[PDB]
DNA sequence: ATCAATATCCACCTGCAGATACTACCAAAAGTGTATTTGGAAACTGCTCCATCAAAAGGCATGTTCAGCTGATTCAGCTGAACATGCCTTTTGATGGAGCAGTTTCCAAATACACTTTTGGTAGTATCTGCAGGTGGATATTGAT
DNA sequence: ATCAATATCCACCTGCAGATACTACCAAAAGTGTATTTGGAAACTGCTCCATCAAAAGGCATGTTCAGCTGAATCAGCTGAACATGCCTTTTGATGGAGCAGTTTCCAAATACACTTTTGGTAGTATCTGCAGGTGGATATTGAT
């Protein structure tokens, strides 16, 4: 009965923006969920350590940013950082 | 009477199983091995079906990986025939051993 | 009521991510932007992989992505492969590859 | 006709794995060598899995137990939860 | 002049118990400090995860204990688990 | 007023281990048994290493343990070697070991 | 500031004899002549990796000084944990 | 005029360096390499001396370990001479490449 | 080369295992209004870190010499690849019930807060002691003969 | 074997850096003692989903045959080890200057927290279809001759 949360729907929305006439199997979706959780934990984990190394009590977008730079390969890292910066900007400039 | 030369079917099998993704160990004998092994850590244990599958996916992935590294070791020694010394050398360099 | 995801231009649940950060014992406190940033990053990465796995599906004359398509996409990209270098994708198999010295001579 | 469980991992199955891993020709000593490796792998993962199970006061090994075991053995698996 | 703390002193006590006539260089003590911090994090960390996996919000001696069985190899785990258990038991009946 | 160490029968600081478990953000709450158990495992492990290093010191005719003696201890003990198998001990060197084929004659 | 010498080709400071000594410690009896450039290249990649991460910690903390701790944290991330310099 | 045969000194060096723990790379040259490389990532950086020593301990430990694995790879090929292909195979199986 | 055996590819067909779609709650995001908490922005220290200069040795660069290792070549013998099939082991699908998971309860044990006490860190001076690096000089080890 | 060159060993011996020793200040812990909150163990039990097993399914054990791979043996070429020789660069240890880590004290902004609305996201249920297999026939590949 109790709710079992997953990303399997945001994943689907993005699937559509990217490949509108393309679907996805249940297993493939399991793999996407594992992915998202994994990367979540890795990035959140580095953020955590960063904050702790610098005696701060707060994980801010800077920690997430530095953490991305440390965890992702070059090109991915670059693009990711700009995406993540664009989204904050768009959220800040939004009364 | 028709007969393929040694290595021709081998290559054929390489192409076939590199295309596909099905598990390559029969489920039941695997499942028994899991249970046999788990018995020494705790008695009267039951296994979700997906748990045993997770295990099998992981072993076969691991073993197929090891065979790649093993093959490179055989080739390194200018052979084409994987041997125990090749599996041992690969495991050693991976840091699973010695 | 506007969702933070919608404010930030995102399909990925900014609120949920905030909650997951709070209740993962990662830090005492969590800035406002962080979960938006993080959400974005996870969306971006998701899209890259779906894009490339989509193409993989297309190449094989198919409309539905399966694990095999994710595997081919990931292992055929220098960067994703590295990011996912210690990860096993169930039901992905491997890339067709045969050492040249094993091919038949004549 | 009684038989060992490890021997249920048969010569042809081991041969199929080797083929998926790109192997052309195989020494006859491999099959026992492989069985021993497989056994160590499974011992290590199951030992940790079951330790998860026990911690959770259960008598059923769940996939998540296995997934977490794989994770901390540096063999992260995707598609069975987590 | 800010207090930089370390295990250098407990380490020395324990040194004197096992080897009463033996000293230790400050570089050797540097290493023993690294060791303690390392194994602290690795146990605390497994525990963190282990509680989180079981939707518990508290790390008890029981989480540490599993943490230890998961982290240490065979015989070391066995002995570490005795001494833990022994300390906790003794501690419990000392108030 | 008795220290918790002494209560528990330990040289290693329970008070301090409790505190580090808090500020390290490992969980919301920490049970009173945790620091006690953890402190004791830590002490056990350091006693194990120091016992083995002390012996290396003595074997090399030395009174004071240095990093080489810690390395010889760890690398020569199968279970310490595995526990610390991805760790580098500064100024420890390596175990003397020469592959047999490399030696002279037959 | 006034000047600051241009650093170039310092990888060649990792000399053939220093590399041989390292090989010896590794138990190597005989060394082909091409080892030395290969070793220099592998070393360069290792350093770049550790230093990028170390400098990344440095920059994150808004310092201009790379600390032993920055290096220790970078080494840990890379799965080359080091004992003897803090942390 | 006296001569040790090829290999004899090599084994002597192996015994010697396996016995000691000093760094085998000269300090100053390694310090420059660090500074040169760091500089390419970022100008106007300074280094605690202990950072450069930490780096040098890490590098030497890595390289010696890589040579052990390399040596195993040569001896697998029935040679006693390490060659680049041995380093390359070691690093592949290590998952560095 | 030619020629047959057999694998492989491609078009087309189709039932249904497994997607996609829809509904309708409702836990959990978002909105609102205080109640803390924090990370700087300025404003100073005392450091470590950089630079540089001189002296000195200790190790590096180089060229010569040839020992013995590597890789090419040949080859014989062993050892794994290929092969047909019914015996038997696994796969498949049907059915009790073990136990995971839902839910509620309540107190043993957790945090919180304000005192009180104690210890572990450093800094100032002082002493000490292990052993690094130097010295012969007695005991191997290696390689020519 | 025997002999000579030279590396190795070991043990004793003085200078001294690094270690141990107080001494003493003290600030930050750690402890102690109520007041307050609650996480999770305990106990009951609903209902998945797991072990078992009967019939249906199709992969593997087997023994023979010989293609071709591995390892042994031989050897010519040349690479890499050893060593002598000439001196550059690293090491060591000063000295000065300052660029900058590291604190401390005030707040303005930012984040948590308790309390209400107001959905977006899930499980349960209902349609919809991609494609896994099947066949049929053409063509490519391999291996014999
Ligand atoms: Mg430059």
Residue numbers in the entry:
A (entry chain H), E (entry chain D): 28 to 122
B (entry chain A): 38 to 135
C (entry chain G), F (entry chain C): 14 to 119
D (entry chain B): 21 to 102
G (entry chain F): 16 to 102
H (entry chain E): 38 to 134
Pull verbatim passages from the article behind this deposition:
Histone proteins package eukaryotic DNA into chromatin, yielding a structural hierarchy, in which nucleosomes comprise the basic repeating units. The H3–H4 histone tetramer organizes largely the central DNA of the nucleosome core, while the two H2A–H2B histone dimers organize the outer DNA regions.
We generated two distinct classes of binuclears with either rigid 1,2-diphenylethylenediamide linkers, yielding three stereochemically distinct species (RR, SS, RS), or flexible methylene or polyethylene glycol amide linkers. To assess the nucleosome site selectivity of the binuclear agents, we carried out X-ray structural characterization of nucleosome core particle (NCP) crystals incubated with each of the compounds. For all of the chlorido agents, substantial adduct formation is observed first at the RU1 site, entailing bifunctional coordination of the ruthenium cation by the E61 and E64 side chains of H2A. This differential configuration allows the RR and SS agents to form bridging adducts at the RU1 and RU2 sites, thereby cross-linking the H2A and H2B histones. Instead, the open, extended conformation of RS fosters coordination of the second ruthenium ion at a more distant histone site, the E91 side chain of H2A. In addition to the primary RU1 and H2A E91 sites, there is some slight degree of adduct generation by RS apparent at the RU2 site, but this must coincide with reaction of a second RS molecule, given the stereochemical constraints of the linker.
